[PDB]
Amino acid sequence: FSNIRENPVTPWNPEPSAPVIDPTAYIDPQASVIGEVTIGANVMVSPMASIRSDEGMPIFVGDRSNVQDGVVLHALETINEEGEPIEDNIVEVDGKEYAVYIGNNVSLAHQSQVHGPAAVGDDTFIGMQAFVFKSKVGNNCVLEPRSAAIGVTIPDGRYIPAGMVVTSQAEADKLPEVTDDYAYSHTNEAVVYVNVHLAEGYKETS
Amino acid sequence: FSNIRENPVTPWNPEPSAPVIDPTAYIDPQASVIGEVTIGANVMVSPMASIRSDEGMPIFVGDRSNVQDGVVLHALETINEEGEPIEDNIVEVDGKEYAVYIGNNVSLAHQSQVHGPAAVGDDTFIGMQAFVFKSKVGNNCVLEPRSAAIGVTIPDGRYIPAGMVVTSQAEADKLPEVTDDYAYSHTNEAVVYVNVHLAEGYKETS
Amino acid sequence: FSNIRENPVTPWNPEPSAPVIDPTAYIDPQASVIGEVTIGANVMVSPMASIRSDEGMPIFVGDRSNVQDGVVLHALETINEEGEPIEDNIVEVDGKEYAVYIGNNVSLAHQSQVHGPAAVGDDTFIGMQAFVFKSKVGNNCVLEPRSAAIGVTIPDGRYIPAGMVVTSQAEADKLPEVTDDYAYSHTNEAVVYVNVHLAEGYKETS
Ligand SMILES: [Zn+2]
Ligand SMILES: [Zn+2]
Ligand SMILES: [Zn+2]
DSSP, rough: OSSOOOOOOTBBBSSSSOOOOOOOEOTTTTTTEEESSSEEEEEETTEEEEEEEEESSSEOTTTTTTEOOOEEEEOOOOOTTTTTEEEGGGGEEEEEESSEETTTTTOOOOEEEEEEEEOOOOTTTOOOOOOOEEEEEOOOOOEEEOOOOOOOEOOTTTOOOTTEEEEOHHHHTTOOOOHHHHHHHHHHHHHHHHHHHHHHHHHTTT | OOOOOOOOBBBTTTSSOOOEOOOOOOOOOOOOOSEEEEEOTOOOTTTTTTEEESSOOEEEOOTTOEEOOOOOOEEESSEEEETTOOOOOOEEETTEESSSSEEETOEEEEOOEEEEEEEEEEEEEEEEEOOOEEEETTTTTTTTOOOOESSEEETTTTTOOOOEEEEOOOHHHHHHBOOOTTTTTTHHHHHHHHHHHHHHHHTTTT | SSSOOOOOTTBBBOOOOOOOTTTTEEEEETTTESSSSEOOTOOEOTTEEEEESSOOOOEEEEETOOEEEEEEEEOOOOOOOOTEEGGGEEEEETTTTEEEEOTTEEEOTTEEEEEEEEEEEOOOOOOOEEEEEEEEEEOOOEOOTTTTEEEEEEEEEEEEOOEEOOOHHHHHTTTTTTOTTTTTTHHHHHHHHHHHHHHHHHHOOO
């Protein structure tokens, strides 16, 4: 079998698409990448990740971002039966439409999940086992381990404390701000540096 | 290696069993299905799922149900050392005994887990990253993302709010009811429709 | 591809290392084990687990311990750019340094994760979907399903209630004690017995 493959023909997908992966990205052999996916340069996709763009599409992962072990990306249907685009399930980023948009320099840590409709802004850390669904996470944010954002917009530069499940815009508006002395303030740039280097190192083993 | 395989011989499993999978089910090549498992028609098993019936057995997945990416099904021992059935670890559904019973038209969403002893009634949605263990989830229920049911019975037609961990029968008795205007009221039938079509589409690629 | 493999050359890893696995351990073909890892005797590594010692290293798993389906072990960098050991990210156990140390007779249940720097004492159960990061879990402990220990030390013989996220030493100091009548008091020794037997049974299929 191939772990990088096209999505299947369905009522909402007349024409199958294969992933477009930059030559500098590393897809582990035990990761799965299916369908209408764009993977940017220097991205590291770890073992057991599953990026599956067969329902809601497309799923984009920007440059120097990392999709860690066991992370799932998938999305709610973006085209219904009759060929109609379901706009509630589509996010818009820089004038383009996506089912899931992961920006540049974003870390999706181990066992986290981003389910479309969703967008994750540049230089944000999505912590271990965290969860994002029907939400827009701004740039320079931090979702600590086991936090979750569902149905909300997380303003730029804010963090979600470990274990907190954010389901209302009123709650997302009062999240705390990332400051220089906040414990995860430098976490994402370290992770990004590491993962870019791991992608290169692992590419030299293939 | 084969990803669909028999369980190993152990003190509690004198005779190995191989999965019984309907020809219309789709098992992704990167899913794992081991042992005394029954998979029904039109079921979709996604990448990185692990259905492992080697301890507690059998594990059943009914018709038109879906086991999404990274979902784990496994169960506590159902036969002890001396060949004795441990009745506390066995669930009974329609006069038959199972370690894990997943009914028909049930969605086990991405990264959720159902650990036996457990039963999940027809047309219920088990949300992303949710958890069911030592529990009986009725039919037409909804476990929102990151909810959990442990050691309880979830009455038919109720939902568990995102992030809520239900560990007592008193709590399960007062869960809210699914109504037409509840946000996840039509989620499972949409997921089921989609996953049945994905199973067929993916079967046409094999 | 090989699922058991060396870590890549990076700025912090001049010399690649391959896993040292006891002949009596069983590594499922759909598990991934990468880099500077030591796996002890009679250990069972299940489908979809990912043990990845490519950043923080080494990762040790002691005798008769089990790494269940979808469990991730990984760790923060232990050597920085300039070849300097980052002592805050290194744990010390019996006079030896590790990125992640999993002791003997420890169960890492399905979908849990232990992220270095971290140590987990002998005969402790890390429950389904639980999370340990920047913490030291003592021996004879129980992390119930969906519990978490972050940045703390969990004293020997204590348990963390299902769903509880422990982030402060004040909180970890007041956790409840495991007693004979506590519900998970015999869980780990049962799991260990089972998993040792599964490792042997599965080794007889290879
Ligand atoms: Zn989905
Ligand atoms: Zn289990
Ligand atoms: Zn990591």
